RNA sequence: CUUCAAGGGCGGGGAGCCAUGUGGACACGACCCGAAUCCGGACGAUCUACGCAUGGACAAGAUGAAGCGUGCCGAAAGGCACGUGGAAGUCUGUUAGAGUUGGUGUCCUACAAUACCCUCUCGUGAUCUAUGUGUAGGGGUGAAAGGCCCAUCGAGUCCGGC
RNA sequence: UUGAGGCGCCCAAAAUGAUCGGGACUCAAAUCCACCACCGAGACCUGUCCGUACCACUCAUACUGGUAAUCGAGUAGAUUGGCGCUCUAAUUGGAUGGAAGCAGGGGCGAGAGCUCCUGUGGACCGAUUAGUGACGAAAAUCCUGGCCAUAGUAGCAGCGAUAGUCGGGUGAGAACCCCGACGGCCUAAUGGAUAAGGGUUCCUCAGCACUGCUGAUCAGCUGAGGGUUAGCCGGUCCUAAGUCUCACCGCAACUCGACUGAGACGAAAUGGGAAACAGGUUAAUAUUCCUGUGCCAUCAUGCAGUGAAAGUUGACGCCCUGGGGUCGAUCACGCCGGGCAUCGCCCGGUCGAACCGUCCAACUCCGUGGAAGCCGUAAUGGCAGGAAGCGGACGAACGGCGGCAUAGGGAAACGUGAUUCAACCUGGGGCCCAUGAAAAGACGAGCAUGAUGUCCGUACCGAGAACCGACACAGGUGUCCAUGGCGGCGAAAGCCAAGGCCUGUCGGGAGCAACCAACGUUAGGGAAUUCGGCAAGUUAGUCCCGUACCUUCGGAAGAAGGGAUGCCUGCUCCGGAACGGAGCAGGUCGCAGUGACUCGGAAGCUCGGACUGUCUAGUAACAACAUAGGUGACCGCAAAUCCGCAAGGACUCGUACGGUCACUGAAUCCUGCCCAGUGCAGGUAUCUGAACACCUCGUACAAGAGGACGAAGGACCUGUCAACGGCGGGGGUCUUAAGGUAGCGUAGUACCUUGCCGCAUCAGUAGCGGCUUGCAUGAAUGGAUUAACCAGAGCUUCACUGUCCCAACGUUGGGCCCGGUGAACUGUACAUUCCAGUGCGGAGUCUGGAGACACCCAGGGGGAAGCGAAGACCCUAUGGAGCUUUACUGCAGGCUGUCGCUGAGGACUCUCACUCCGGGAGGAGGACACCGAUAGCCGGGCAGUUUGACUGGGGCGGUACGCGCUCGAAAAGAUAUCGAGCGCGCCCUAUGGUCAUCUCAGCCGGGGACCCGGCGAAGAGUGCAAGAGCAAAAGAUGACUUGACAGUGUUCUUCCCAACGAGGAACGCUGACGCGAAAGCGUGGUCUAGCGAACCAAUUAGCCUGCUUGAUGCGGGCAAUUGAUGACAGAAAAGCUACCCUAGGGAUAACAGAGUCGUCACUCGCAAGAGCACAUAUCGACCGAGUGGCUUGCUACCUCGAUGUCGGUUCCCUCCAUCCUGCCCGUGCAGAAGCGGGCAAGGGUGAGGUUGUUCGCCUAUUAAAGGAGGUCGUGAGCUGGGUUUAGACCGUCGUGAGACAGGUCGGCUGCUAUCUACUGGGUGUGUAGGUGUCUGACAAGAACGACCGUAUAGUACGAGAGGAACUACGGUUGGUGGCCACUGGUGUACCGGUUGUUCGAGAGAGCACGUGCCGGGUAGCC
RNA sequence: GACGCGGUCGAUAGACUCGGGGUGUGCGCGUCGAGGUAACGAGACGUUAAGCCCACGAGCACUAACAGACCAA
């Protein structure tokens, strides 16, 4: 939910 | 939104009291059934946590002990007076009818008896100048000219410690240091600085007020903030 | 019935009522599960935020403010030198303690639902900290990040409305 | 010579392995023309059976007979007969001679299912009929339970705490239970004492089923017993912030609520406080028990005393500092004991309290004295208002001294002095816009003797196993020990005592491989690495010398740079002295003297924020927040601001030098213009402006209508920008008020853009400077500038280095093998795959081929669009929430009028209610204010909601959202698209109606007016689109007229077929009319567009009707007209979300795929043209034909219960449209150098500077430094610079939330491999006992590619300049395989030097992270 | 796991001794030593190509390759 999984 | 910091305020929580249990003495005058055979002698000059100005102690001929609005130049020692008849120089206290015209007074009272509202904060004093068997026009140090009843009594010469303002604060730990005793929250942000949802400035990809800072007077709490019922704003013109 | 009139509408030469099964409709949970809500009353400041009360903590070193002194110079004002002094939201510092920049290292079914190591910042102050205490849910608290209010926050949690 | 036809050829380039399905086929197994015979469905024919329908017979839907060429497939769905389950009832049966259930088996039925046999079981079970219903499962990421694979797999290694080993003891059993030795670990803790918290965990005995990361004889485990002793330690008492209770008051009410009053509560380490010490004792308590000694309080008695309450104490902040002084530590010497054994050193001990008595330094004061310059301090300071000196009063320690003590303790001695001095005592100084508790109690206030002194707590842990964190959790958790030794500035490192521990609790084995984690060292080069020097490294302590720009004069600054540094011998100086400090001379060792350890890399330019400080607990520490400073606003306190429903409250023990509300954000130089809009505020003739009362009308009253008066507010006017904000276009004013001043400027703001010039570099999208027209800078939305500061952003230099060229060796823990322990993720099934194809367009399973004996070990992760998470993006839903506003609607609140409280004589006096001040007397105020009620205005402060649909996704645009015409529309009717052309939302009293008279456009002839004639079926005109109609008219002219009439229908249309309203039309009737001779025409305009529901109002004519009844008023209704809903078959309605949330969708976008190929790339045909002449050496337009699938676009097939982005990197394969290399052809080919073309994919195609970049620009090298495919190959490989979350800034836009196909700083990369795949390693089986040697089907290779030089030759060629080749040689480069004599690296084997510490020194050793550091280095590996 | 070699008819491994190598001159003692009354004394020279050390080679049956089990047409 931050960009990459999971940033 | 969120009720904005004006509005905890009045709800009287710890944060935005103040420490009064810290405080010495709420200074008021004293009574006298008349005549005003009262008197003391200056026992000592302390420090006033509530107005960071001197306050001195004195000593009646009745053996009373109180801390008293200390004008400029009470010293230890020195005898002050209370009544109709104490005698017109500093630190005496007596109706303004008594009161020579043109002789700078402070700690007046708005109704005789109240023990003293006006004119109280460091150097500051209020100006006797007309006389009268109903009105004794006095100018309070914010330039107002207060009609007040000549019974109303006061203290004569300006008050102690004037000059504080003066010297800047040049550092916020020096502000910290006051505001601790005090009742008001501090450090400020600026509503500007803030979320919508906690302020009508709130909000914004860049900071700015909303709408215009100058508030109708009608205003509720919760919107009343910025420019309260301004005449006008600005330095110019 | 409408209608000068005319023409239209509705009705008319005796079949229903009740019961039992069953088809379908509408209201209700309405074939069953499935989600983010909204509202009510309660329980939470053992976490954490901010304030208050009462206690506690900060090796060692550096720099050397005012003030004072001695000497020289000057009519004086005052100047210069040296010393004394020991100021500071001052410096160095893994003192204690507080914090958390990079390694985008280790870990990532962990030692751990936020850890480990090195690196790094502050370290007499707007400092750190124990205990006590106050503020409660559209309300607190907030040097403001929509941060925090017991792993829960752009409106806590529990049960109820359901 | 020319025409036509057939088959073929050229044209003809693609990515893992070629293809017609494959093999393969050539007088065919191809192609075309005929022909012959066959094969081949469930079709067709045919036997039997079944169902269904119908016929005959029948009560029958039971039999029996008959008919079906014209019956037999089916999702959703309608209809119908039946099977099975539970319990009820009626009728009727079975079972211990064995019921139900279960397992295996036999029979029947199309089937649901029925039944039998054998075994098991051991007590219930059916049938028929009629009922009953929590009645039938493969599915829901379904629920609960159980279970397999996973797997004897991961973990029991990683932490600066690496810990053990040999003997022995006990035991059935011992790596880990115990004893000894040896070896280690912990030093503010791994020691000692405790708070909270736990709660018996403590001690003993007995045990091992449980718990313990292995085992256990051990245990915080299991069981049973036992254990905590107080006048003098805590609680208890006191009061703190503050809390509760009662009263009072509020509230509809309370378990609610503020104030006031009274009462109580509120501190166990760590606030105040009456009093206890020493020794001994238990398995476990201990200032508690025991022995000794001491002390406090109260009380009783006795003597004393009549004092006694004033005062002192309790009792207090931060910074500096002196003096007194104990323990400790150390020095000296003596004594006792131990240790060591070349020396004479080294360690331990040398004790002794509370209490009672006594001593008193500092401070203060007194007498004397009499200083005019002296006295005094570390410093400040002191004095004729009396200095020093002298005498004296008061007066301290947890300290000295005596006792206590022929007490206690010690094996013994059972010391004495000194220095530095924690504790404790007592002083001096400085700071505050900060002022640093209270109360109980104590003292004041004597002594003897005796008595009493109850109640509660007391064990143990206090943590890498007793607490919180689900755990014996690497986390979290307060206090006192800060004085143990060396070291050194040190509470630092390192080493070592005392004390503790070997439980940060699984072990054994392999020079111990690959790979991984931590780390050491690497030659030459030295940032070439990379977004970036990330990571690592360099530097380092102390002293001496020396130190730039700039600066707010503080700083910059440890700038920079240079030198020194050890040991030994003998000394000097400072000081009372130190086992303190500063130096001197001589001698002397090493590569190295802060020898280890500790221990800055330095310099410059630019951006930002001034500084210290704050922040997103858990991806953002920053430029964001704060700050002082600047500024504006409000308010005289019965205030402003704010909380409460109220009673009431904060600010406020406050008072303008205040405090509230905002903006800006240190200093310095400054801060221009604009009041039109919006906001706020002031004013206001006039206008507007609600309700009550008042007047008129109305009504026997009332509803209701109108008037008069008119508050705040608005209109209007003014003020105000450090108020929201604005600061252009045009010309030598215009919008809308002004029209950008100082500055600054390609900016964190500049699209163009890598702007231009310069600096710097080989090369610089960077950085800096200048210019600057600024897409779209600019003054407290603060502008410019700026010293200092900074885990902030960018850049440069020196230094440094394994970041890199380019990797190697080593060290420690894993990994691998063995014993023990022992999970999870995941699983529709099947599964040895590979190349192709096909398929819903991204297949291990389909099709064709190829390959493939089984099982197992290790590996790195290619595939299983791998595992994990019902996609966060996008759309959709008449979903949610937070937020905004001049969206809709309301609700608080503020202002204002009116009524009540409320009283006496459009302005005024008064006092008596009421309010406030005052202790009271009494003062102020006063019918106002407050309060209750109502009305008008303001009113995102708050609440609920809305904010439509269509659409080659959505948005923007548009409206194909209601209508009419042509075409599309395929000659009936119907017919879609954001299809093509274009219109309607009216207009007309005549532009309607009838009748009469008449014929038009255009052209010709005679006198673009008018008159006459002729031609003239229609091109004129007919209101308006388009299509259509019309000529004795539907047109023109004239006249007359109102049928544009009322009522009610029929039918068609709207809506083909085929239901649906309003609307429309055609055609009637009834009534009344107009015109005409009359037939007849007129239900508006020649026809198809010009339209609107219910509710409500108004209106038209008559009538019906309102609660027992009559009258009046005012209502309710039948019929109809008008008023709008254009989203046009009718809701009353704005936005943001990157803070987000849910339901879903591949119904729909973004990536990728797939189709397409306009675009893009490349080619071909024709060949104008030019190339001095010459198309074709070379270049090559137009036009035409194509190939590819790299670009772009289109589409919306696949995927939204997840196929991870760009770029880069690494590693592998491929394509050819070839850049180089080989062999060639042409030339505008003399040669040399080129140019163009052909074959050709074997090999090669490299290094760097800016930029995240791909791309591209640039540099120097080069044979050349080609392009492209592999999910834009490659994130279960890496990286994370850009895109693309949450924070923040700038510009632009917006009222605002907030937005941007603008810029900028910051910002967490998950998973143990089941299968398949390949790289290597084994065990088996097959060929059917053995040893040794071979063969070679097939398989792999680039095993080799390229360049330079010499001779050829200064030759051929050439006027000359210039300048080849065949061949033969030498070497270089890249690649490849191997090897270590040589050189080089490593080399925690080894040897040496040396620092600190410890074993007394010496000798010889340990530790300093897995070598302390330094020097050398064998083998091996490289 | 596998592979290779040796196993007394033996040099496979270890010990010992040589050889071949790494360091860089051992402890002790003697002389010198700036000095110092002496005590004491950093260090220098000699003894000492010393001492210490070796993952290699050789010699050498001294020690251990013993004992013996199994499968197999
Ligand atoms: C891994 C994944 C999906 C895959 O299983 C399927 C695909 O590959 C398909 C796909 N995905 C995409 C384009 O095609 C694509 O672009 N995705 C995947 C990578 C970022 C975004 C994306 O939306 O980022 C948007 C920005 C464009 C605003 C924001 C940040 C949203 C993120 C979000 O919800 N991530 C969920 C992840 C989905
Ligand atoms: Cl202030
Ligand atoms: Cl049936
Ligand atoms: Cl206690
Ligand atoms: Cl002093
Ligand atoms: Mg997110
Ligand atoms: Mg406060
Ligand atoms: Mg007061
Ligand atoms: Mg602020
Ligand atoms: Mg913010
Ligand atoms: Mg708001
Ligand atoms: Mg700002
Ligand atoms: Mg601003
Ligand atoms: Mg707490
Ligand atoms: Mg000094
Ligand atoms: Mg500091
Ligand atoms: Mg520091
Ligand atoms: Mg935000
Ligand atoms: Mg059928
Ligand atoms: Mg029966
Ligand atoms: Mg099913
Ligand atoms: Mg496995
Ligand atoms: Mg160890
Ligand atoms: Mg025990
Ligand atoms: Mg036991
Ligand atoms: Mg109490
Ligand atoms: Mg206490
Ligand atoms: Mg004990
Ligand atoms: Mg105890
Ligand atoms: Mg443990
Ligand atoms: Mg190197
Ligand atoms: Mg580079
Ligand atoms: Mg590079
Ligand atoms: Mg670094
Ligand atoms: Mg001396
Ligand atoms: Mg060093
Ligand atoms: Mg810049
Ligand atoms: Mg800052
Ligand atoms: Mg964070
Ligand atoms: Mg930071
Ligand atoms: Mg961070
Ligand atoms: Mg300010
Ligand atoms: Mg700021
Ligand atoms: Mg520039
Ligand atoms: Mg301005
Ligand atoms: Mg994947
Ligand atoms: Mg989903
Ligand atoms: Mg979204
Ligand atoms: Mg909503
Ligand atoms: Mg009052
Ligand atoms: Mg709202
Ligand atoms: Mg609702
Ligand atoms: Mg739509
Ligand atoms: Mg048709
Ligand atoms: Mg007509
Ligand atoms: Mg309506
Ligand atoms: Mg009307
Ligand atoms: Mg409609
Ligand atoms: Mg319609
Ligand atoms: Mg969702
Ligand atoms: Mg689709
Ligand atoms: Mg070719
Ligand atoms: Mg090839
Ligand atoms: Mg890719
Ligand atoms: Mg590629
Ligand atoms: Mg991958
Ligand atoms: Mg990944
Ligand atoms: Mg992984
Ligand atoms: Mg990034
Ligand atoms: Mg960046
Ligand atoms: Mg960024
Ligand atoms: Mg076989
Ligand atoms: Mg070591
Ligand atoms: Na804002
Ligand atoms: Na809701
Ligand atoms: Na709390
Ligand atoms: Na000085
Ligand atoms: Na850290
Ligand atoms: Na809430
Ligand atoms: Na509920
Ligand atoms: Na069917
Ligand atoms: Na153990
Ligand atoms: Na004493
Ligand atoms: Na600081
Ligand atoms: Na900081
Ligand atoms: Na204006
Ligand atoms: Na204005
Ligand atoms: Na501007
Ligand atoms: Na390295
Ligand atoms: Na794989
Ligand atoms: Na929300
Ligand atoms: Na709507
Ligand atoms: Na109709
Ligand atoms: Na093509
Ligand atoms: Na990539
Ligand atoms: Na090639
Ligand atoms: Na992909
Ligand atoms: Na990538
Ligand atoms: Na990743």
Redesign the pocket.
């Known amino acids: 939910x931050?960009x990459?999984?999971x940033x | 939104?969120?009720?904005?910091?004006?509005?905890?305020?009045?709800?009287?929580?710890?944060?935005?009291?103040?420490?009064?249990?810290?405080?010495?003495?709420?200074?008021?005058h004293r009574?006298?059934?008349?005549g005003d055979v009262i008197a003391g002698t200056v026992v000592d000059i302390?420090?006033?946590?509530?107005?960071?100005?001197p306050v001195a102690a004195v000593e009646f001929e009745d053996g009373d002990r109180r801390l008293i609005?200390a004008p400029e130049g009470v010293g230890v020692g020195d005898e002050l007076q209370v009544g109709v008849s104490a005698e017109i120089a500093p630190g005496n206290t007596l109706p303004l009818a008594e009161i020579p015209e043109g002789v700078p007074v402070?700690?007046?009272?708005?109704?005789?008896?109240?023990?003293?509202?006006?004119?109280?904060?460091?150097?500051?004093?209020?100006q006797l100048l007309t006389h009268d068997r109903?009105v004794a026009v006095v100018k309070?140090?914010?330039?107002?000219m207060?009609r007040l009843?000549p019974?109303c009594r006061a203290t004569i010469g300006?008050?102690a410690?004037?000059?504080?303002?003066?010297?800047?604060?040049?550092?916020?730990?020096?502000?910290?240091?006051?505001?601790?005793?005090?009742?008001?929250?501090?450090?400020?942000?600026?509503?500007?600085?803030?979320?919508?949802?906690?302020?009508?400035?709130?909000?914004?990809?860049?900071?700015?007020?909303?709408?215009?800072?100058?508030?109708?007077?009608?205003?509720?709490?919760?919107?009343?903030?910025?420019?309260?019922?301004?005449?006008?704003?600005?330095?110019?013109?």
């Open positions: 931050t990459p999984f | 939104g969120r009720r904005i910091q004006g509005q905890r305020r009045g709800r009287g929580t710890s944060t935005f009291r103040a420490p009064s249990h810290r405080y010495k003495a709420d200074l008021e009574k006298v059934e008349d302390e420090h006033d946590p509530a107005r960071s100005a609005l402070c700690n007046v009272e708005s109704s005789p008896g109240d023990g003293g509202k006006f004119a109280r904060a460091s150097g500051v004093n209020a109903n309070l140090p914010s330039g107002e207060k009843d019974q300006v008050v410690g004037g000059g504080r303002t003066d010297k800047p604060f040049v550092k916020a730990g020096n502000k910290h240091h006051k505001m601790k005793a005090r009742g008001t929250k501090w450090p400020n942000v600026r509503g500007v600085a803030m979320n919508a949802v906690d302020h009508p400035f709130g909000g914004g990809g860049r900071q700015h007020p909303g709408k215009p800072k100058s508030i109708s007077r009608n205003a509720p709490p919760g919107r009343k903030v910025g420019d309260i019922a301004s005449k006008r704003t600005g330095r110019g013109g």
